[PDB]
Amino acid sequence: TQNPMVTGTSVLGVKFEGGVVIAADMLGSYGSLARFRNISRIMRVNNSTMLGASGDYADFQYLKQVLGQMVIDEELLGDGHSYSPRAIHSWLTRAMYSRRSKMNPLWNTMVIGGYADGESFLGYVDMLGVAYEAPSLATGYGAYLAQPLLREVLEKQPVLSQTEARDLVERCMRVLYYRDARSYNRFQIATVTEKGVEIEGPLSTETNWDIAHM
Amino acid sequence: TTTLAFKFQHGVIAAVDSRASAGSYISALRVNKVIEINPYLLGTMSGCAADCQYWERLLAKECRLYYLRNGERISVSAASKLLSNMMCQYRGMGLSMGSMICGWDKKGPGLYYVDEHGTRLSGNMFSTGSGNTYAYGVMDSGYRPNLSPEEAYDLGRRAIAYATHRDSYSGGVVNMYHMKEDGWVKVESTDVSDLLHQYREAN
Amino acid sequence: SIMSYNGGAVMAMKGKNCVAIAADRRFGIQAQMVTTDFQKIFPMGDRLYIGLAGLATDVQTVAQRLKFRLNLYELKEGRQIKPYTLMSMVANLLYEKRFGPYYTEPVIAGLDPKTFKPFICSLDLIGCPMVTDDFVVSGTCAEQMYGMCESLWEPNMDPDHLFETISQAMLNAVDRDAVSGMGVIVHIIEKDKITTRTLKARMD
Amino acid sequence: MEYLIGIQGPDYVLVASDRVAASNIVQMKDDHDKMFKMSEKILLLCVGEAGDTVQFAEYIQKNVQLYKMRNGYELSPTAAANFTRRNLADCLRSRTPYHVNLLLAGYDEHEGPALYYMDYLAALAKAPFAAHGYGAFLTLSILDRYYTPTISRERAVELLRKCLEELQKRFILNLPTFSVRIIDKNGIHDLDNISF
Amino acid sequence: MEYLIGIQGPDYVLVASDRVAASNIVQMKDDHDKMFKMSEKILLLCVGEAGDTVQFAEYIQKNVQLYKMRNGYELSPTAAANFTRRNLADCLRSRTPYHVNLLLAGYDEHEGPALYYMDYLAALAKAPFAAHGYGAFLTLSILDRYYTPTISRERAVELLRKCLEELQKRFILNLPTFSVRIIDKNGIHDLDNISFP
Amino acid sequence: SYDRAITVFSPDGHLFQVEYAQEAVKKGSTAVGVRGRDIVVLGVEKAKLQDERTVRKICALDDNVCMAFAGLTADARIVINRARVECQSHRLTVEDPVTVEYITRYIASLKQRYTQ
Amino acid sequence: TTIMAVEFDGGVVMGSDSRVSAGEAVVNRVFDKLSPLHERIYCALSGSAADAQAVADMAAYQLELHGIELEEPPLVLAAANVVRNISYKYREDLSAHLMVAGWDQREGGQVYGTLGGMLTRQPFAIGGSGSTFIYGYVDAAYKPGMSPEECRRFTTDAIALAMSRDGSSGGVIYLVTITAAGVDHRVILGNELPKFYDE
Amino acid sequence: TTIMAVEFDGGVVMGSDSRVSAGEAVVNRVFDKLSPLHERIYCALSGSAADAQAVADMAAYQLELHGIELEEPPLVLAAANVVRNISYKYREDLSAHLMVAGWDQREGGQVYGTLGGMLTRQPFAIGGSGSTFIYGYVDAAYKPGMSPEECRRFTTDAIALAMSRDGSSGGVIYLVTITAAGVDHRVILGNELPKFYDE
Amino acid sequence: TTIAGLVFQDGVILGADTRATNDSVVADKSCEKIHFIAPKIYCCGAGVAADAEMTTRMVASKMELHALSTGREPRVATVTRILRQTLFRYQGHVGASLIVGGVDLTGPQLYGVHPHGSYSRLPFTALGSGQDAALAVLEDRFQPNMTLEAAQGLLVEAVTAGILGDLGSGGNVDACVITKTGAKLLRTLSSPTEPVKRSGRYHFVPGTTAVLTQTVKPLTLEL
Amino acid sequence: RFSPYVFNGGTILAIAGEDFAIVASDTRLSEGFSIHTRDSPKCYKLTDKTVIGCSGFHGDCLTLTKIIEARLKMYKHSNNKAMTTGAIAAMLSTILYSRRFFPYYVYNIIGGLDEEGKGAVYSFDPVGSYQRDSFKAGGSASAMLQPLLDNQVGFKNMQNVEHVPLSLDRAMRLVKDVFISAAERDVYTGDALRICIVTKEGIREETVSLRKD
């Protein structure tokens, strides 16, 4: 992709005691037009891994096909081995870098959340092959609004509970709905724990507009 | 960079500066701008540092292959020709490499100038790099084919020291070699600013 | 770049009851050195000096136009200018050309003509002033000077300690800059005297 | 593309300039003079763009001559060099900037001999020796190598000849002849042209 | 920026070329040779971009020498001029076009003396006299004025000298020395270089 | 493309195709070479109605190198033209001319390649 | 931005969204884009914020002095020509569209478009980046003879519909009803917006 | 162009305008932009005419051979994927949006968007240059559970509304109703179009 | 730069960071970005430092003339007008992004003034490269009619989010609390980064610098 | 248009002693005027006697790093021995030059021990030019750190000073000071300083705090 078409905005993610939670609105914008207000930008990879994507939706749908088929292929072997969140993150870095190096990128920024062998995984990959791990992630415009709030809480309390992480993510989605002109008040929250990957939605934040009288 | 080489009664003198620049920043104060291919073959380097180092080391590997294949060293004309063809193969690609292939073969002392365009000139005096004009002025003024070894070493060290004073992209040390019938000798590696201070103190 | 056409480095450093001001001495046009004794530090009073790096023509115009306004000021006021007032005067001068500026970034160093307390400051090309209690730098080697200054500077240096700090910060900074150098000149400004020294520096 | 050179000695200033007036690939004149007399002891050597050089040099010359007429004495080499810089710097950010590179050589009764270098941006530098044009890249190191502050006028002409020989050998441009003049306490003296 | 000249007489071809090898504002070589021997009776004078000139001239030279080795006889000046044109024209619309301007001077037992002009586009012209470079703008009218088809070699060298003197007088580029050669029924003969103090 | 292995090893360790090519040499006209002090001589054994020039077995490869052959004359022509191209290609890549050993080494490696 | 004005018998209704955005960044989420030019004359601001505010201020100043010299409140046509003349004189340097609407004792409730220095009186008018998505809606939903309450409802539905499709529109809806009686300002909060299909 | 597709219980309705224009020039005023991909699968063409026709033809060819090998009519999902794959593989060289809709024995009446190589199933979908002006209209007028006649009426009103606002849309409206029973093609002439506000 | 503003129960609180960067290089670790306009009117500046410096200086000067003539305490809407109309004439070429906060006869007011001449009255605002970090903290916890101590805490948190999150921001948090009884300038209200000390034993023995020339000019004759 | 590169920041430094080598880096990963992570050290252990510092475009840092790891394994399998510090340096120049027309946007500094057990530093430019150094600074703050190293480690511009060799203790304090000074003035250097020490015993690591703003 040289020019993205239908694009998705910020994807959030935060590690908690016992898993990871990611959040993303259900909007596909065509420039400023909120063209598709009901599309899922989150994907269950396997029982340990989940993925959310900012950027071009068509490029995300392609990656979702390629990733989904890799998981089917692996499950046909039934040999006791399965892709860890960290291996999916690693594959995606190579895949993005390879496309970047051919001057035909997959126009996305992604957040991979995982839970394997008692450890929480949170990783970022961009369209150039820039990848890393952190206790919290926020793509797109969320890197400017949501990440300062995720980091502010994680400074005071480095290890959050599943409920503490969830309330913080819900507060971030509200700030993003107010300040990001390419967002929508319809989102999903996906959680990965020992039990597996659960995607909840469609969700909405209770807005307040009392400042209109100040 | 400033590189110079001249043939004289006692062989070939070859001198280089040692500065590397990333724009206006001096990225290295002392780099070796001479490759020693064998005891009878040297290459001065100017232009893009990576191009110089890779292509001159590729010429060195080809010279080494020639010795293994023929039990004899390559001639200065054939080595300079090999490098010239490497440059022609990549013309228009944006390589930047000026070099002087200096040696002693069955035809006596040899000195060739080779460009990234494929230019290949035999001659008895050349100078390459951003400071080449300053080196030419000094070298031309004090040159005689009958210079003694010490008189030639003074001319080489002075042309490079004076080029480093006027050219902002030249500086560091002068690395000078003397190519004799029985092979080259590294004459000296002298701080160019100490030489300039010494010249000034004699005024 | 316009600022790198001639090059050069200027720095000021605060001490205990004294200030220092230093500059390189090169005058060059791109890679060609023309002169090795170019004046970049100009006295604006007995204990007040301005250091100007950048485009050579504008270093000379700004120093001359500043001297003009200063002479008229001390004649009308019947007093020597205060360091902070000379800073405001340079700011006004530079900001008057906000949309076609002089390519120079001044550095001011002095002692108050009444309070004798050290003053150091710098201004950008459009006259934004910046006062500091340690050092100010301007030139084509500002990163090199910031590294040297940040590491070598200490709070209450005596004139001789300050002289060694500013000298080593300038020498080592300009020796990693292709278009700065050809010598370094240092001025140490004390209540009782001005010490001017040229250093034995690299000439390449 | 044109050449200017000045060598300042203890009590004199030696100056030279090429004599070629060129247009495109043709030398239209082989005997052209690039020097301008300002005062009895000042020469302004001027090179650069076609119209600019004579327009700028002549304007300064007539205003320097106006000073002499209004006051009964001439401007010093320093005052003339600074007046030249003020005009060139004032035109720099104007509608009409002059693309001229110049050298001002003079002799003052109190200060002695002086050589000033000025580029088209109007940076002004006092120099023991200086050169303008592509030729300066080939000749500045010759002056660095052989110049000493006590150089006699006899030695200065051999040093100048060394520079001019270097252009004949290495400079791709023709430049066969050079105007040569020297200033001292007795004014401006014409020397023989250097020819090859 | 470099100079080539050829004057074809009744039974000879006189050619000259400058001896400067230059880089930027510097004359790197004062004794450089721009002529290439193809056969015993053919010279290819080559000028243009830095890499292209020797690469192109040498490739043609070795293929002309290959023809001599394979068949026991050499190519005629016409066949060599046309073979040179074919290669230059084939590279014209390719990835590797050579920016070379050249003159081919030869002698054939049957056809007599010949002078061919070729530009970097590969246009080929037979000429009684020709010149390449900025110098040709100052010297072509001298040849128009003084050349006659019956010009003797003695007179041809005087005419060549008249052209080379004009460059010293009016051309802004140095060019002090010139290589001079003449071809006839006895092959390529080296003449003294034309030099100016 | 025809990719059959023509010359292969036989049970005794022989390359029959190469030995059969040596039988064709044995049937060719006798060629003799003698290296003297300042001269080298080649002589070859010899139809009245034939033009002698078109069938000479002593060929020049370059100005300093020449050769004679014995065996299949059409095969020889191919070897000779490849040697001739190589001599010019050598002058073009390294400037200096070919040595008798360099061009012999080239012809020998060409022959070996056609056996593997 | 989505701005809208509707004429009715005895006055006008004007509405706007509240989003001010610098690209993808919402700089102000509660901006009132309805500015008074006089007691019963308002304008709806869209386009460049700096230009729209500058024009609105000069028009309010010009109209104040006009109203005092004439000893009457200015006509809505005079306000419409004051804005229009400014927008036209400086059409190459200004990038704002100020819709002018209000009430007169002479012509009553009137709505005027001043797009690029032109002047047109309309039964209703829509403007801003958001107006693009509601052209079909206003053409399908507009009926002649609407009451003040029906106009407010229409403006609210149309602006809510645009706010949901346009990234550059959002927040609350500001309504203003100008009649001979005076002006009624009203706010429909971002939670109390009318709901339609939004998937 | 204005293209539209609506799902109902038992099938789909697809509509298009009929204008083909090269800038300000109407080259064809009666073009049918509804093309059959299979017996009960159609696509709605928009964007580049050459690209849209090329993709439609390759998709029809691919789906015909697919249908024969599978011994069944292709699924509408298989048709939508076939179109989506061509549009996505050649996204930097094709400038068309082919909306794919039809009927199946497995999923029934389904509508799919393939815009830029993506794939999404929608209750209804609109495309083309004209769709811009009717986003608010379709959001205000769409109701779940519409009958085949109500879908045709909705598609006709929405397309007529866009045709009146869009210079690049016009002519007649072409309708296609795909059910298990078969396909009904219908034409609403430029004189018999539904009327709305047009001033 | 991270500059923020907030309207609370009895006034306004302006906040600013203290870093000045010259293209990815920190030039000033301790600059004052909260400027005086009038005793109860202050202004945070961001954008082109010289433009913010000279525009605030100019309006403070015009406001002193206005107050001297009128004999009254100046209004916050007057500084907004003067600033707006000056910036509009320059078409965005005067790169001053300002946060004007103050108290007048009509109470506390807060405004955002942009380089092109546009403005907005707001209960809370943030400008500069670190504006989104500050704005996220304000959107997350702002509530109307906050107490001075609750509003100061929110303001310090908002400027701190920008200091840590924005590369173009840093140093200390400066604040200005404006109420009906004047303004309290809290220079260095908080330092998110505690003294980063080191073993900076870099001393040169006198004589290590080689000197070529020395001249001593005495001044005791004048003293 | 699409740009395949981005500047992610980071500063690296290496010092070679008589029997040691230090390779240090900050841990900040940036993009624009924002921080990706505060825990991204730039030192990569290659062998027991060689570590590499990598700085620049992080997609290239990750890729080039994985290529070096695969190449060391390939060499160990073919030659039945680990690559020496010098051999890694010569090979790395060729990997960088293989991309001369689409460079890896990486500033690399190798630090380890040579075959005599002495400390070795090898620094490169993105396209592969290199040499052996006694000390070197790379990355965003290289221009700030290098002149101090020239002065304090190379003893330049000092008269009448004892040219005492660099001890590990002295070098460690100097790396800590220069990274504190770099973090004060460079916006791309901060959060923490990872120091890697190579000796005959092996590789030790230290982490020291740096400014968080």
Ligand SMILES: *[B]([O])([O])[C]([C]C1=[C]OC2=[C][C]=[C][C]=C12)[N]C(=O)[C]1[C][C]2[C][C][C]1O2
């Ligand atoms: B010279 O031309 O200024 C110089 C040549 C150079 C520098 O370092 C080496 C190492 C080996 C051979 C030659 C050489 N070039 C430079 O200073 C620059 C540094 C690097 C990037 C541009 C150019 O090459």
Ligand SMILES: *[B]([O])([O])[C]([C]C1=[C]OC2=[C][C]=[C][C]=C12)[N]C(=O)[C]1[C][C]2[C][C][C]1O2
């Ligand atoms: B709308 O067309 O998106 C809108 C108009 C608007 C918003 O806020 C104001 C304030 C005053 C007058 C008009 C106005 N435009 C904007 O919000 C944009 C933000 C900023 C950059 C372009 C324009 O001004």
Ligand SMILES: *[B]([O])([O])[C]([C]C1=[C]OC2=[C][C]=[C][C]=C12)[N]C(=O)[C]1[C][C]2[C][C][C]1O2
């Ligand atoms: B529509 O998006 O404006 C329209 C679609 C169209 C028109 O004619 C056909 C024929 C076949 C498939 C689609 C179709 N597009 C056009 O009219 C355009 C004019 C021309 C250049 C692009 C396309 O063809």
Ligand code: NA
């Ligand atoms: Na130098």
Ligand code: NA
């Ligand atoms: Na500065």
Ligand code: NA
């Ligand atoms: Na320097």
Ligand code: NA
């Ligand atoms: Na919206």
Ligand code: NA
């Ligand atoms: Na229409």
Ligand code: NA
């Ligand atoms: Na930092």
Ligand code: NA
């Ligand atoms: Na920060």
